[PDB]
Amino acid sequence: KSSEAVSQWLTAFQLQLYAPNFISAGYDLPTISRMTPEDLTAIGVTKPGHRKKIAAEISGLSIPDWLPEHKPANLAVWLSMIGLAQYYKVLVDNGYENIDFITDITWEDLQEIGITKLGHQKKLMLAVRKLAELQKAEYAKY
Ligand SMILES: [K+]
Questions:
Q1: Cα(57)–Cα(79) distance, rounded to whole angstroms?
Q2: Domain named SAM: which ranges?
């Protein structure tokens, strides 16, 4: 249903030819909505004209909040909440079994352990920043 929704979003403004680009990188509309243009380049959308239509349509997206507004009890809950539970084992087996360890993580670290799909990295990285923001929100108090 996710890839379905990406296809449809792109066919709606005639750029479905890039569906493979987004989909095979594991992008989903939520994650797409937070793409920088650098991200766009990375998945092969390089033609300025198409970049710009997509960039405009990206800002045009209005889709419900999906990042957890609270730090969850454990890695399983968290991965589940952001729809990347298939990485539970690889993360745990590579020493990222608790949330705190993730918050330090970078894309280089994800590449090391095999989580390479750029869309998944983006989503994973977006989720990590939100935790980082939620932490600092405590120290302002404490
Ligand atoms: K699963």
A1: 28
A2: 1-64, 70-134
CA dihedral 73, 1, 117, 42 (to 10 degrees): -120
Backbone angles phi, psi at 77, to 5 degrees: -50, -50
Helical segments of the chain, H only: 2-11, 19-24, 29-32, 37-42, 48-60, 75-81, 88-93, 99-103, 107-113, 118-139
Check: CB of residue 122 under 8 Å from CB of residue 34: yes
Q: How far is the CA of 51 from the centre of ligand 1 (A)?
A: 32
**CB of 49 closer than 8 Å to CB of 140:** no
Here the tokens at position 37 are 């243009």
In the chain the domains, ranked by start, together with CATH numbers, are 1-66 (1.10.150.50), 67-142 (1.10.150.50)
C-alpha pair distances (Å), 39 with each of 8, 14, 29: 20, 20, 14
